[PDB]
Amino acid sequence: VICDGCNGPVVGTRYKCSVCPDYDLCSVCEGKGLHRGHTKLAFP
Ligand SMILES: [Zn+2]
Ligand SMILES: [Zn+2]
């Protein structure tokens, strides 16, 4: 899984947007508030 924020890996917790098709964030990008205006699921 590739982070749509930074093009890096999504290892550990994956943050998947519940609105967009196929939009995933890594924990660094999530913690920096990228794509914060949509509800996401965080799963281990
Ligand atoms: Zn990232
Ligand atoms: Zn989204």
Residue numbers in the entry: 126 to 169
The authors write:
Intriguingly, it was recently reported that the central ZZ-domain in p62 plays a critical role in the recognition of N-terminal arginylated BiP/GRP78 by the Arg-tRNA transferase ATE1.
The structure of the ZZ-domain of human p62 (residues 126–172) was determined by a single-wavelength anomalous dispersion method at the zinc absorption edge. The N-terminal U-shaped loop of the ZZ-domain is maintained by Cys128 and Cys131 residues coordinating to a zinc atom. One side of the protein surface is covered by a highly negatively charged patch formed by four key residues (Asp129, Asn132, Asp147, and Asp149), which is more narrow and shallow compared to previously determined structures of N-recognins (UBR box). These four residues are highly conserved among p62 proteins, but not in other ZZ-domain proteins. Therefore, two zinc atoms are critical for not only stable folding of the ZZ-domain, but also for proper location of the key residues involved in recognizing N-degrons. Since the structure is very compact with loops tightly connected by two zinc atoms, no marked conformational changes were identified.
